[PDB]
Coordinates of C-alpha atoms and ligand atoms in Angstrom, one line a residue:
Chain Z
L1 CA -11.0 8.6 -17.3
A2 CA -8.2 6.8 -15.3
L3 CA -5.4 9.1 -16.5
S4 CA -7.3 12.2 -15.2
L5 CA -7.7 10.9 -11.6
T6 CA -5.8 12.4 -8.7
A7 CA -3.8 10.2 -6.3
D8 CA -6.7 10.5 -3.7
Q9 CA -9.3 9.6 -6.3
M10 CA -7.2 6.5 -7.4
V11 CA -7.1 5.3 -3.8
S12 CA -10.8 5.9 -3.2
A13 CA -11.7 3.9 -6.3
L14 CA -9.4 1.0 -5.4
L15 CA -10.7 0.9 -1.8
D16 CA -14.3 0.9 -3.2
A17 CA -13.5 -1.9 -5.6
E18 CA -12.0 -4.1 -2.8
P19 CA -13.8 -7.6 -2.8
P20 CA -15.3 -9.0 0.4
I21 CA -13.7 -11.5 2.7
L22 CA -15.4 -14.9 2.3
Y23 CA -15.9 -18.0 4.5
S24 CA -15.0 -21.6 3.7
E25 CA -17.9 -24.2 3.7
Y26 CA -19.0 -24.5 7.3
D27 CA -18.1 -27.4 9.7
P28 CA -16.3 -29.9 7.4
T29 CA -14.8 -33.1 8.8
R30 CA -11.9 -32.4 11.1
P31 CA -9.1 -33.3 11.1
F32 CA -8.2 -32.9 7.4
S33 CA -7.2 -35.4 4.8
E34 CA -5.2 -34.4 1.7
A35 CA -8.3 -34.4 -0.6
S36 CA -10.7 -32.8 1.9
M37 CA -8.4 -29.8 2.6
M38 CA -7.8 -29.3 -1.2
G39 CA -11.5 -29.5 -1.8
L40 CA -12.3 -26.7 0.7
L41 CA -9.4 -24.6 -0.5
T42 CA -10.5 -25.1 -4.2
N43 CA -14.1 -24.2 -3.3
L44 CA -12.9 -21.0 -1.6
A45 CA -10.5 -20.1 -4.4
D46 CA -13.3 -20.5 -7.1
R47 CA -15.7 -18.3 -5.2
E48 CA -13.1 -15.6 -4.7
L49 CA -12.3 -15.7 -8.4
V50 CA -15.9 -14.5 -9.2
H51 CA -15.3 -11.5 -6.9
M52 CA -11.9 -10.9 -8.5
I53 CA -13.4 -10.5 -12.0
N54 CA -15.7 -7.8 -10.7
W55 CA -12.9 -6.2 -8.8
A56 CA -10.7 -6.1 -11.9
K57 CA -13.5 -4.3 -13.9
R58 CA -13.4 -1.5 -11.3
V59 CA -9.6 -1.0 -11.5
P60 CA -9.2 2.3 -13.4
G61 CA -7.7 1.6 -16.9
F62 CA -8.6 -2.1 -17.0
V63 CA -12.1 -1.7 -18.6
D64 CA -10.6 0.5 -21.4
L65 CA -8.7 -2.6 -22.7
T66 CA -10.2 -5.2 -25.1
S67 CA -11.9 -8.3 -23.7
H68 CA -9.1 -10.5 -25.0
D69 CA -6.5 -8.4 -23.2
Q70 CA -8.5 -8.3 -20.0
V71 CA -8.6 -12.2 -20.0
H72 CA -4.9 -12.3 -20.7
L73 CA -4.0 -10.1 -17.8
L74 CA -6.3 -12.1 -15.5
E75 CA -5.0 -15.5 -16.7
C76 CA -1.4 -14.4 -15.9
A77 CA -2.3 -12.7 -12.5
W78 CA -5.1 -14.6 -10.8
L79 CA -3.0 -16.8 -8.5
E80 CA -0.7 -13.8 -7.6
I81 CA -3.8 -11.8 -6.8
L82 CA -5.2 -14.7 -4.6
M83 CA -1.9 -14.9 -2.9
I84 CA -1.3 -11.2 -2.1
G85 CA -4.9 -11.2 -0.7
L86 CA -4.2 -14.2 1.5
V87 CA -0.9 -12.8 2.7
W88 CA -2.5 -9.4 3.5
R89 CA -5.3 -10.8 5.7
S90 CA -2.8 -13.1 7.5
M91 CA -0.6 -10.1 8.6
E92 CA -2.2 -10.0 12.1
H93 CA -1.8 -13.8 12.6
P94 CA 2.0 -14.5 12.8
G95 CA 2.8 -18.2 11.9
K96 CA -0.7 -18.7 10.4
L97 CA -2.5 -18.2 7.1
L98 CA -6.0 -16.8 7.2
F99 CA -7.6 -18.5 4.2
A100 CA -10.9 -17.5 5.6
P101 CA -12.1 -16.3 9.1
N102 CA -13.3 -19.8 9.8
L103 CA -10.1 -21.4 8.3
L104 CA -7.0 -20.2 10.0
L105 CA -4.2 -22.7 9.2
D106 CA -0.7 -22.9 10.8
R107 CA 2.5 -24.3 9.1
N108 CA 1.9 -27.9 10.4
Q109 CA -1.5 -28.2 8.8
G110 CA 0.1 -27.4 5.4
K111 CA 2.0 -30.8 5.8
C112 CA -1.4 -32.5 5.3
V113 CA -1.3 -31.9 1.5
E114 CA 2.2 -32.9 0.2
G115 CA 4.4 -30.3 -1.4
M116 CA 2.2 -27.6 0.0
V117 CA 4.4 -26.9 3.1
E118 CA 7.1 -25.3 0.9
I119 CA 4.5 -22.9 -0.6
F120 CA 3.0 -22.4 2.9
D121 CA 6.4 -21.2 4.2
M122 CA 6.9 -18.7 1.4
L123 CA 3.5 -17.2 2.0
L124 CA 4.2 -16.9 5.8
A125 CA 7.6 -15.2 5.1
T126 CA 5.9 -12.6 2.8
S127 CA 3.2 -12.0 5.4
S128 CA 5.9 -11.4 8.0
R129 CA 7.7 -9.1 5.6
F130 CA 4.5 -7.0 5.1
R131 CA 4.2 -6.9 8.9
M132 CA 7.8 -5.6 9.3
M133 CA 7.2 -2.9 6.7
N134 CA 3.9 -1.9 8.3
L135 CA 2.1 -2.2 5.0
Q136 CA -1.0 0.0 4.8
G137 CA -4.4 -0.9 3.2
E138 CA -4.0 2.0 0.7
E139 CA -0.6 0.6 -0.3
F140 CA -2.0 -2.9 -0.5
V141 CA -4.7 -2.0 -3.1
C142 CA -2.2 -0.2 -5.2
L143 CA 0.1 -3.3 -5.2
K144 CA -2.8 -5.6 -6.2
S145 CA -3.7 -3.4 -9.2
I146 CA 0.0 -3.4 -10.2
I147 CA 0.0 -7.2 -10.2
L148 CA -3.1 -7.3 -12.4
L149 CA -1.7 -4.7 -14.9
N150 CA 2.0 -5.7 -14.8
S151 CA 2.0 -9.6 -14.9
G152 CA 0.7 -10.1 -18.4
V153 CA 1.8 -6.9 -20.1
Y154 CA 5.1 -8.2 -21.4
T155 CA 3.7 -11.3 -23.2
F156 CA 1.0 -9.4 -25.2
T157 CA 0.3 -4.2 -34.7
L158 CA -1.1 -0.7 -33.8
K159 CA -3.9 -2.0 -31.5
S160 CA -1.7 -4.0 -29.1
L161 CA 1.0 -1.2 -29.1
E162 CA -1.6 1.4 -28.1
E163 CA -3.0 -1.0 -25.4
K164 CA 0.5 -1.6 -24.1
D165 CA 1.4 2.1 -23.6
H166 CA -2.0 2.7 -22.0
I167 CA -1.2 0.0 -19.4
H168 CA 2.2 1.6 -18.9
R169 CA 0.6 5.0 -18.2
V170 CA -1.9 3.5 -15.7
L171 CA 1.1 1.9 -13.9
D172 CA 2.9 5.3 -13.9
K173 CA -0.3 6.7 -12.2
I174 CA -0.3 4.0 -9.6
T175 CA 3.4 4.7 -8.9
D176 CA 2.6 8.4 -8.4
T177 CA -0.3 7.4 -6.1
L178 CA 2.1 5.2 -4.0
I179 CA 4.6 8.1 -3.7
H180 CA 1.8 10.5 -2.7
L181 CA 0.6 8.2 0.1
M182 CA 4.2 8.0 1.4
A183 CA 4.6 11.8 1.2
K184 CA 1.3 12.4 2.9
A185 CA 2.3 9.9 5.5
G186 CA 5.3 12.1 6.2
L187 CA 8.2 10.1 4.7
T188 CA 11.3 12.0 3.3
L189 CA 12.0 11.8 -0.5
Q190 CA 14.8 9.3 0.3
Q191 CA 12.5 7.2 2.4
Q192 CA 9.8 7.4 -0.3
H193 CA 12.0 5.9 -3.1
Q194 CA 13.4 3.2 -0.8
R195 CA 10.0 2.1 0.4
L196 CA 8.6 2.1 -3.2
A197 CA 11.5 -0.2 -4.3
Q198 CA 11.0 -2.5 -1.2
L199 CA 7.3 -3.0 -2.1
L200 CA 8.0 -3.6 -5.8
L201 CA 10.9 -6.1 -5.0
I202 CA 8.4 -8.1 -2.9
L203 CA 6.3 -8.5 -6.1
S204 CA 9.1 -10.6 -7.7
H205 CA 8.8 -13.1 -4.7
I206 CA 5.0 -13.1 -5.3
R207 CA 5.5 -14.0 -8.9
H208 CA 7.9 -16.8 -7.8
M209 CA 5.4 -18.1 -5.3
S210 CA 2.7 -18.0 -8.0
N211 CA 4.8 -20.1 -10.4
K212 CA 5.6 -22.6 -7.6
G213 CA 1.9 -22.6 -6.8
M214 CA 0.9 -23.4 -10.4
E215 CA 3.5 -26.2 -10.6
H216 CA 2.1 -27.6 -7.3
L217 CA -1.5 -27.4 -8.6
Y218 CA -0.7 -29.1 -11.9
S219 CA 1.1 -31.9 -10.0
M220 CA -2.4 -32.8 -8.5
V221 CA -9.4 -27.0 -11.2
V222 CA -7.3 -24.1 -12.7
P223 CA -9.3 -21.4 -14.6
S224 CA -8.9 -21.7 -18.4
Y225 CA -8.9 -18.8 -20.9
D226 CA -12.4 -19.7 -22.0
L227 CA -13.8 -19.8 -18.4
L228 CA -12.3 -16.4 -17.6
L229 CA -13.7 -14.9 -20.9
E230 CA -17.1 -16.3 -20.1
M231 CA -17.1 -14.8 -16.6
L232 CA -15.8 -11.4 -17.9
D233 CA -18.8 -10.9 -20.3
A234 CA -21.3 -11.2 -17.4
Chain W
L1 CA 32.6 -0.8 3.1
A2 CA 29.6 -1.1 0.8
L3 CA 27.3 1.0 3.1
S4 CA 29.8 3.9 3.0
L5 CA 30.0 4.1 -0.8
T6 CA 28.6 7.0 -2.8
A7 CA 26.3 6.5 -5.8
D8 CA 29.2 7.1 -8.2
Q9 CA 31.5 4.7 -6.3
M10 CA 28.7 2.0 -6.4
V11 CA 28.4 2.4 -10.2
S12 CA 32.2 2.4 -10.8
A13 CA 32.6 -0.8 -8.8
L14 CA 29.7 -2.6 -10.6
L15 CA 31.0 -1.5 -14.0
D16 CA 34.5 -2.8 -13.0
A17 CA 33.0 -6.1 -11.9
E18 CA 31.2 -6.6 -15.2
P19 CA 32.1 -10.0 -16.9
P20 CA 33.4 -10.3 -20.5
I21 CA 31.2 -11.2 -23.5
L22 CA 32.1 -14.7 -24.6
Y23 CA 31.9 -16.6 -27.9
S24 CA 30.3 -20.0 -28.6
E25 CA 32.5 -22.9 -29.7
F26 CA 21.3 -27.5 -36.2
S27 CA 19.5 -30.4 -34.4
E28 CA 17.7 -30.1 -31.1
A29 CA 20.7 -31.7 -29.2
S30 CA 23.5 -29.8 -31.1
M31 CA 21.9 -26.4 -30.4
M32 CA 21.3 -27.2 -26.7
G33 CA 25.0 -28.5 -26.5
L34 CA 26.4 -25.2 -27.8
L35 CA 24.1 -23.1 -25.6
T36 CA 24.9 -25.3 -22.5
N37 CA 28.6 -25.0 -23.2
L38 CA 28.3 -21.2 -23.4
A39 CA 26.1 -21.0 -20.2
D40 CA 28.6 -23.1 -18.2
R41 CA 31.5 -20.9 -19.2
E42 CA 29.5 -17.7 -18.3
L43 CA 28.7 -19.2 -14.9
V44 CA 32.4 -19.3 -14.0
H45 CA 32.6 -15.5 -14.7
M46 CA 29.3 -14.9 -12.8
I47 CA 30.8 -16.3 -9.6
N48 CA 33.7 -13.9 -9.8
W49 CA 31.4 -11.0 -10.7
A50 CA 29.2 -11.8 -7.6
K51 CA 32.2 -11.7 -5.3
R52 CA 32.9 -8.1 -6.5
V53 CA 29.3 -6.8 -5.9
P54 CA 29.6 -4.6 -2.8
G55 CA 27.9 -6.2 0.2
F56 CA 27.9 -9.8 -1.2
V57 CA 31.4 -10.8 0.1
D58 CA 30.4 -9.7 3.7
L59 CA 27.8 -12.6 3.8
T60 CA 28.6 -16.1 4.9
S61 CA 29.6 -18.7 2.2
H62 CA 26.4 -20.6 2.8
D63 CA 24.3 -17.4 2.1
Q64 CA 26.4 -16.5 -1.0
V65 CA 25.7 -20.0 -2.4
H66 CA 21.9 -19.6 -1.7
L67 CA 21.6 -16.2 -3.4
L68 CA 23.5 -17.6 -6.5
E69 CA 21.5 -20.8 -6.5
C70 CA 18.3 -18.7 -6.6
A71 CA 19.5 -16.1 -9.1
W72 CA 21.9 -17.7 -11.6
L73 CA 19.4 -18.1 -14.5
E74 CA 17.8 -14.7 -13.9
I75 CA 21.3 -13.2 -14.1
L76 CA 22.1 -15.2 -17.3
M77 CA 18.8 -14.0 -18.8
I78 CA 19.2 -10.3 -18.0
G79 CA 22.7 -10.4 -19.5
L80 CA 21.4 -12.0 -22.7
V81 CA 18.5 -9.6 -23.0
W82 CA 20.9 -6.6 -22.4
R83 CA 23.3 -7.6 -25.2
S84 CA 20.3 -8.3 -27.6
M85 CA 18.9 -4.8 -27.2
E86 CA 20.5 -3.5 -30.5
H87 CA 19.2 -6.6 -32.5
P88 CA 15.4 -6.4 -32.6
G89 CA 13.8 -9.8 -33.2
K90 CA 17.0 -11.6 -32.3
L91 CA 18.9 -13.0 -29.3
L92 CA 22.6 -12.4 -29.2
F93 CA 23.7 -15.5 -27.2
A94 CA 27.3 -14.7 -28.4
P95 CA 28.7 -12.4 -31.1
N96 CA 29.1 -15.5 -33.3
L97 CA 25.6 -16.9 -32.3
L98 CA 22.8 -14.4 -33.1
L99 CA 19.5 -16.4 -33.2
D100 CA 16.1 -15.2 -34.4
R101 CA 12.7 -16.5 -33.2
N102 CA 12.4 -19.2 -35.9
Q103 CA 15.6 -20.9 -34.8
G104 CA 14.1 -21.2 -31.3
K105 CA 11.6 -23.6 -32.8
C106 CA 14.5 -26.2 -33.3
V107 CA 14.4 -27.0 -29.6
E108 CA 10.8 -28.1 -28.4
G109 CA 9.2 -25.7 -25.9
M110 CA 12.0 -23.1 -26.2
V111 CA 10.1 -20.8 -28.6
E112 CA 7.8 -19.7 -25.7
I113 CA 10.8 -18.7 -23.6
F114 CA 12.5 -17.1 -26.7
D115 CA 9.4 -14.8 -27.1
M116 CA 9.5 -13.7 -23.5
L117 CA 13.2 -12.9 -23.8
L118 CA 12.6 -10.8 -27.0
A119 CA 9.7 -8.9 -25.4
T120 CA 11.9 -8.0 -22.4
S121 CA 14.7 -6.9 -24.8
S122 CA 12.3 -4.8 -26.7
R123 CA 11.0 -3.3 -23.4
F124 CA 14.6 -2.3 -22.4
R125 CA 15.0 -0.8 -25.9
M126 CA 11.8 1.3 -25.5
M127 CA 13.0 2.5 -22.0
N128 CA 16.5 3.4 -23.4
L129 CA 18.1 1.4 -20.5
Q130 CA 21.6 2.5 -19.7
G131 CA 24.6 0.4 -18.9
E132 CA 24.8 2.0 -15.4
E133 CA 21.2 1.1 -14.8
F134 CA 21.8 -2.4 -16.1
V135 CA 24.5 -3.3 -13.6
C136 CA 22.4 -2.0 -10.7
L137 CA 19.5 -4.2 -11.8
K138 CA 21.8 -7.2 -12.0
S139 CA 23.0 -6.7 -8.5
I140 CA 19.4 -6.3 -7.3
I141 CA 18.6 -9.7 -8.8
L142 CA 21.5 -11.3 -7.0
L143 CA 20.7 -9.8 -3.7
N144 CA 16.9 -9.9 -3.9
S145 CA 16.0 -13.3 -5.4
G146 CA 17.1 -15.6 -2.5
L147 CA 18.5 -11.7 11.1
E148 CA 21.7 -9.6 10.8
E149 CA 22.5 -11.0 7.4
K150 CA 19.0 -10.2 6.2
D151 CA 19.0 -6.6 7.3
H152 CA 22.5 -6.1 5.8
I153 CA 21.1 -7.3 2.4
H154 CA 18.1 -4.9 2.8
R155 CA 20.5 -1.9 3.5
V156 CA 22.6 -2.8 0.4
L157 CA 19.4 -2.9 -1.7
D158 CA 18.5 0.6 -0.3
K159 CA 21.9 1.8 -1.4
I160 CA 21.4 0.4 -5.0
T161 CA 18.0 2.2 -5.0
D162 CA 19.7 5.5 -4.0
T163 CA 22.3 4.9 -6.8
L164 CA 19.5 4.3 -9.4
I165 CA 17.7 7.6 -8.4
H166 CA 21.0 9.5 -8.5
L167 CA 21.8 8.3 -12.1
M168 CA 18.3 9.5 -13.1
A169 CA 18.7 12.9 -11.3
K170 CA 22.2 13.3 -12.9
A171 CA 20.6 12.4 -16.3
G172 CA 18.2 15.3 -15.7
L173 CA 14.9 13.5 -14.9
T174 CA 12.3 15.3 -12.6
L175 CA 11.5 13.8 -9.2
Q176 CA 8.2 12.5 -10.7
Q177 CA 10.0 10.9 -13.7
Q178 CA 12.6 9.4 -11.4
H179 CA 10.1 7.4 -9.2
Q180 CA 8.2 6.3 -12.3
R181 CA 11.3 5.0 -14.1
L182 CA 12.5 3.3 -10.9
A183 CA 9.2 1.5 -10.6
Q184 CA 9.2 0.6 -14.3
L185 CA 12.7 -1.0 -14.0
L186 CA 11.7 -2.9 -10.9
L187 CA 8.5 -4.2 -12.4
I188 CA 10.4 -5.7 -15.3
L189 CA 12.3 -7.8 -12.6
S190 CA 9.1 -9.7 -11.9
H191 CA 8.9 -10.8 -15.6
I192 CA 12.5 -11.8 -15.3
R193 CA 11.7 -14.0 -12.3
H194 CA 8.8 -15.5 -14.3
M195 CA 11.0 -16.2 -17.3
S196 CA 13.6 -17.8 -15.0
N197 CA 11.0 -20.1 -13.4
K198 CA 9.7 -21.1 -16.9
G199 CA 13.3 -21.5 -17.9
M200 CA 14.0 -24.0 -15.1
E201 CA 10.9 -26.0 -15.8
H202 CA 12.0 -26.2 -19.5
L203 CA 15.6 -27.1 -18.6
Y204 CA 14.4 -29.9 -16.2
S205 CA 12.1 -31.3 -19.0
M206 CA 15.3 -32.1 -21.0
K207 CA 17.9 -32.6 -18.2
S208 CA 23.5 -27.8 -7.9
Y209 CA 24.2 -26.3 -4.4
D210 CA 27.4 -28.4 -4.0
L211 CA 28.7 -27.3 -7.5
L212 CA 28.1 -23.6 -6.7
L213 CA 29.7 -24.0 -3.2
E214 CA 32.8 -25.7 -4.8
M215 CA 33.2 -22.8 -7.3
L216 CA 32.7 -20.1 -4.7
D217 CA 35.6 -21.3 -2.5
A218 CA 38.1 -20.9 -5.5
Ligands
G91_301 O1 25.2 -17.4 -22.4 C1 23.9 -17.9 -22.3 C2 22.9 -17.0 -22.1 C3 21.6 -17.5 -22.0 C4 21.3 -18.8 -22.2 C5 22.3 -19.7 -22.5 C6 23.6 -19.2 -22.6 O2 22.1 -21.0 -22.8 C7 20.9 -21.6 -22.4 C8 21.1 -22.4 -21.2 C9 21.7 -23.7 -21.3 C10 21.9 -24.5 -20.1 C11 21.5 -24.0 -18.9 O3 21.7 -24.7 -17.8 C12 22.3 -26.0 -17.9 C13 22.5 -26.6 -16.5 N1 23.4 -25.9 -15.7 C14 24.8 -26.4 -15.5 C15 24.4 -26.9 -14.1 C16 24.2 -28.4 -14.0 F1 25.5 -29.0 -13.9 C17 23.1 -26.0 -14.2 C18 20.8 -22.7 -18.8 C19 20.6 -22.0 -19.9 C20 19.7 -20.7 -22.2 C21 19.9 -19.3 -22.2 C22 18.7 -18.4 -22.1 C23 18.1 -18.4 -20.7 O4 17.9 -19.7 -20.2 C24 17.5 -20.7 -21.0 C25 16.2 -21.2 -20.8 C26 15.8 -22.3 -21.6 O5 14.6 -22.8 -21.4 C27 16.6 -22.8 -22.6 C28 17.9 -22.2 -22.8 C29 18.3 -21.2 -22.0
G9J302 C1 -2.9 -19.6 -2.2 C2 -4.1 -20.5 -2.2 C3 -4.0 -21.8 -2.5 C4 -2.7 -22.5 -2.7 C5 -2.4 -23.1 -4.0 C6 -1.2 -23.7 -4.2 C7 -0.3 -23.9 -3.1 C8 -0.7 -23.4 -1.8 O1 0.1 -23.5 -0.7 C9 -1.9 -22.7 -1.6 C10 -5.2 -22.7 -2.4 C11 -5.8 -22.9 -3.8 C12 -6.5 -24.1 -4.1 C13 -7.0 -24.3 -5.4 C14 -6.9 -23.3 -6.3 I1 -7.8 -23.7 -8.2 C15 -6.3 -22.1 -6.1 C16 -5.8 -21.9 -4.8 O2 -6.3 -22.2 -1.6 C17 -6.5 -20.8 -1.6 C18 -7.8 -20.4 -1.3 C19 -8.0 -19.0 -1.3 C20 -7.0 -18.1 -1.5 O3 -7.2 -16.8 -1.5 C21 -5.7 -18.5 -1.8 C22 -5.4 -19.9 -1.9
NI303 NI1 9.9 12.1 -5.5

């Protein structure tokens, strides 16, 4: 019933689906070594991934797809989704990344890892950019769902063609929802289309960061297809 | 001058800036040699195209090099995908070099990138992407991919957005259809970024700033 929802019903459902903010393992050895910091971040990321699977099932349109296609979208999007979440909760802490409420890290602590500092900087710039745009929570949840639905759709017979157009219609509905929030907020038609484009252009930088992130992770714990398909069935 | 242009003047300037379609001059090496020769020749035309994108020449030479360093492969890729639209299941690298999926297997690891390029081409075919929309998307890539210089870039991007909406309104689309199509085109740019990052990784598996800064000064 995702194509029959209004803009306000889409927002309400995405806000209800929103996963909880988690904490890192309490009182680890401080200061950090390269391994210890990666261990705590990896533990946190894995626990968030369990909540992401459950979030994804409550994104309208996603559950209508086949289990194979749900796994494919999540396999393509999981690190982008982790990253936009991080960047969102770091908005109110300029020069810092709020990995958890008990794990607020500045740029200099990123140097502890080796190659992480470049990715750190990109995440901070994006956070700063969301701060400058005054990004709203309602807009945030729409952007997250876009990432999930958009990131794997291009790399997907009758079945797959019907699944692809279904995804494209859901994305059209999220666009409508984004415009409605901006019109309800009071922005002019010109300001609405400009802000929409600004938000969607930021998603290309998020993809870039996610690809750099993967390369950095493989240089040193990444969810496989089989792992994600096991988790989805539960 | 770029902030004072109308939607129609933006389109006319981008269409005038458009580079020419070039010709090429198999083993894994021989195919990569011909593709690399072609890519290098197109890169000379891209530098000159970039200088004629309204807003780009106002930036410093350092910032022009940075935008091009970040965007060159995305720009090469959207060009390829655009000229392949009318050849389903094939990539038109040049008019004398039309390659299907199976010839991508000749170079190891290329076939995955081949597939992504074909899917994007197919997606532009399904959207009935227009030449006027294409040139706007290309300029977006250049300006978006890489304090007064930053806000200048953001204003130029706002003008290209306006231009995109105007083309859709002039084409007859409703306000709802206009914002949906705008979003659809911009979402495709994330896949182009992805392809470009995969492309780089693949290129470094086989094989600069200074080179691009040298070319820009000419
Ligand atoms: O006209 C075209 C249009 C598209 C392409 C194309 C030619 O050829 C090649 C190509 C060759 C060399 C390059 O870079 C070589 C290195 N350059 C020269 C500088 C070093 F001195 C950087 C860059 C690209 C090509 C495409 C498709 C998109 O990008 C690719 C990704 C791949 O994984 C494999 C091949 C390509
Ligand atoms: C973005 C990110 C990580 C990250 C990854 C690469 C580079 C970087 O700077 C940060 C790193 C991470 C570590 C291990 C895995 I498996 C996945 C993410 O730790 C995180 C924890 C929570 C979260 O919401 C995001 C991240
Ligand atoms: Ni509108």
